[PDB]
Design a protein around this ligand. Sequence first.
Ligand SMILES: Cc1cn([C@H]2C[C@H](O)[C@@H](COP(=O)(O)O)O2)c(=O)[nH]c1=O
Ligand SMILES: [Mn+2]
Ligand SMILES: [Mn+2]
Length: 178
Amino acid sequence: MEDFVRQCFNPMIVELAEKAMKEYGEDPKIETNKFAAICTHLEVCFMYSDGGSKHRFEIIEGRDRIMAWTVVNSICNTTGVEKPKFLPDLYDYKENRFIEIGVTRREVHIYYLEKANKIKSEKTHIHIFSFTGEEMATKADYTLDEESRARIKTRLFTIRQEMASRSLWDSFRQSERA
Ligand SMILES: Cc1cn([C@H]2C[C@H](O)[C@@H](COP(=O)(O)O)O2)c(=O)[nH]c1=O
Ligand SMILES: [Mn+2]
Ligand SMILES: [Mn+2]
């Protein structure tokens, strides 16, 4: 699994993921499924941000904490949007709302409710993806065009397929907890 991550994700993504885990006191070489989940999530976030107009999205995930909240607070101050309690993943300039992205090894609906329950904030939009082609977004508003979405969904299947061809999928798939 460690070798899989290092081969399938780019070095920038792998460095951010390694850093995030170490910040929690976890070793990417040991909690290898979490390493892969974090990389996959980061990758999805970057793809989503590249999926509309140039400049449509501000990326929040992947920034250090200080720069993250600088972006968030600056956005809230300039748009008067409500200040979220937790850092979201992106801001959508066109819709004027924060986005929370989830990638799940379980099922799209359960993860959606878990995110909803954490968020509280009425405004932050939630969009969940799975590795089996499903998606789920607040008020069935999927934000991006279906071709952008299809590229994310396809990339996640392609990850799943690679993990399975290395016999990594079964363990990965059962590693996410409520
Ligand atoms: C906020 C947070 C996320 N994560 C992981 C869970 C997900 O795989 C990934 C992204 O989280 P997010 O979906 O809340 O943006 O980071 C942690 O391990 N610890 C944390 O404190
Ligand atoms: Mn995040
Ligand atoms: Mn997220």
